[PDB]
Amino acid sequence: AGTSICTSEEWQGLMQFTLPVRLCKEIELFHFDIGPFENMWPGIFVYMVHRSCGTSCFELEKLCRFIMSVKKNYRRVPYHNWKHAVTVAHCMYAILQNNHTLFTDLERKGLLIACLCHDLDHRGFSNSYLQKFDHPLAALYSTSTMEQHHFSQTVSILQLEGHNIFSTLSSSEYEQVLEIIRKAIIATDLALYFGNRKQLEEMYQTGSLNLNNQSHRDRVIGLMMTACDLCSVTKLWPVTKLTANDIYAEFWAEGDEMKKLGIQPIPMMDRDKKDEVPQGQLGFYNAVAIPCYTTLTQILPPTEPLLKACRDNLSQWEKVIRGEETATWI
């Protein structure tokens, strides 16, 4: 029921927040893991917007209201939560810092906000679920159901009194940024990823890819959104392994719901099929993450460390399968 608004207490605090010095250099790296710094997450987001877009990109008060209200519109679900939002935004920051001039000031502001907002009000249910059991959302949004919902929630937050960080933009630029943000959130539907990646791969291989071609730009941005959304697979193995427990915790709760409604879930959502997870992650890396980061690296060479990390994690899942796992804490 409705869109949640942060307290004066919340946003004034973030305004007064300052980032410990040692973290400045860390935040720049692809592999950086926000995990051990929970109190600082909203502040790390300020810092990234200020570094990428400049301290004058947004009136700070409205930026701070926007971020903390964004936080309050994430749910307490094991995975599609506030921590994932900031993780995704950080990956985008590393991509943009490493490819800064390829992207307009409008694209950078739009994309960091899109990443932070891309799973707003996620309920711990997949599009598969909502469409299977005809949730009202599936009727409103026949395809990319939750993603269209996340964009809707983003616009609602902006429309809160004192939250509209895009107000100072020309009328034309405003429409462009909302369009940037809409396309970027929609692209985080993995259903679209398969065709997008295949197109981009084709365009790269034939040499037709042209970044001054809007339709090409939209697709590159789309794959960037995929890379950022899946970035848990690009971290150090223990970090990757730990996040995966959260991914599966959320899936298995969905599977539990399906069982009550007389449908056996897919194995991935079946908590009594845990022995199949390492092989499922192997399949997910083979069909999704590997090709994603491969293509992204061809298009944006400086993103190559995301790909090497993901190949290292693939190998770690293969070790698990062979029975060579050593001690893991969770």
Ligand X SMILES: Nc1cc(Cl)nc(N)n1
Residues of the binding site for a divalent metal cation: 84, 118-119, 229
297 is in the binding site of which of ligand X, Ni ion, none (Cβ under 5 to 8 A by kind)? none
Phi, psi of 329 (to 5 degrees): -110, 145
Q: Is 88 in the site for ligand X (CB under 6 A)?
A: no
- Cβ atoms of 165 and 158 within 8 Å: the answer is yes
Active-site residue, 80 included: yes
C-alpha R_g of the chain: 20
The residue of the chain with the least Cβ separation from ligand X equals: 284
For 134, residues 6+ apart whose C-beta sits below 8 A from its C-beta are: none
Tokens representing 39 are 């109190």
14: contact with ligand X by CB under 6 A: no
If one asks whether residue 121 binds Ni ion (CB under 5 A), the answer comes out as no
Residue 119 interacts with, from ligand X, Ni ion, none (CB under 5-8 Å by kind)? Ni ion
If binding is defined by CB under 6 A, does position 127 make contact with ligand X?
no
232 is a site residue for ligand X (CB under 6 A): yes
141 near ligand X (CB under 6 A)? no
> Of 208, 212, 190, 191, whose CA–CA distance to 200 is shortest?
208
Please tell me the count of residues contacting Ni ion according to CB under 5 A: 3
Angle, CA 217 vertex, CA 214 and CA 223 arms, to 5°:
145
Handedness of CA 268, 271, 277, 281 (dihedral sign): positive
Residues 6 or more apart whose CB falls under 8 angstroms from that of 219 comprise: 196, 199, 200, 203
**Which of 63, 247, 277, 310: binder of ligand X (CB under 6 A)?**
247
Stretch touching Ni ion by CB under 5 A, among 63-71, 106-114, 229-237, 320-328: 229-237
**CA dihedral sign of residues 43, 47, 218, 294:** negative
The alpha carbon of 191 is separated from its chain's Cα centroid by a whole number of angstroms, namely 15
- Among residues 11 and 252, whose Cβ is nearest to Ni ion? 252
Question: What is the DSSP annotation of 58-72?
Answer: S-HHHHHHHHHHHHH
**Structure tokens, 273:** 């099929």
**The one segment of 103-111, 158-166, 199-207, 226-234 that binds ligand X by CB under 6 A:** 226-234
Inter-axis angle of helices 214-229 and 190-206, nearest 10: 130
Out of Ni ion, ligand X, none, which partner does residue 247 contact, by CB within 5 to 8 A per kind? ligand X
33 binds Ni ion (CB under 5 A): no
CB closer to Ni ion out of 15 and 137: 137
Distance (Å, whole) CA 215 – CA 199 = 11
Q: Is 233 in the site for ligand X (CB under 6 A)?
A: yes
- Kindly tell me which of 113 and 209 has the beta carbon lying closer to Ni ion: 113
Task: Check residue 52 for interaction with ligand X (CB under 6 A).
Answer: no
230 counts as binding ligand X under rule CB under 6 A: yes
284 binds ligand X (CB under 6 A): yes
Q: CA-to-CA distance for 161 and 284, rounded, in angstroms?
A: 42
List the one residue from 10, 107, 119, 250 that touches Ni ion (CB under 5 A). 119
**169, 107 contact by CB (below 8 A):** no
**Binding residue positions for 3',5'-cyclic AMP:** 80, 281
> Considering the rule CB under 5 A, would residue 254 count as an interface residue with Ni ion?
no
**Residues in binding site:** 80, 84, 118-119, 229, 281
Q: Which residues bind ligand X (CB under 6 A)?
A: 230, 232-233, 244, 247, 284
Which positions lie near Ni ion, rule CB under 5 A? 119, 188, 229
Active site residues: 80
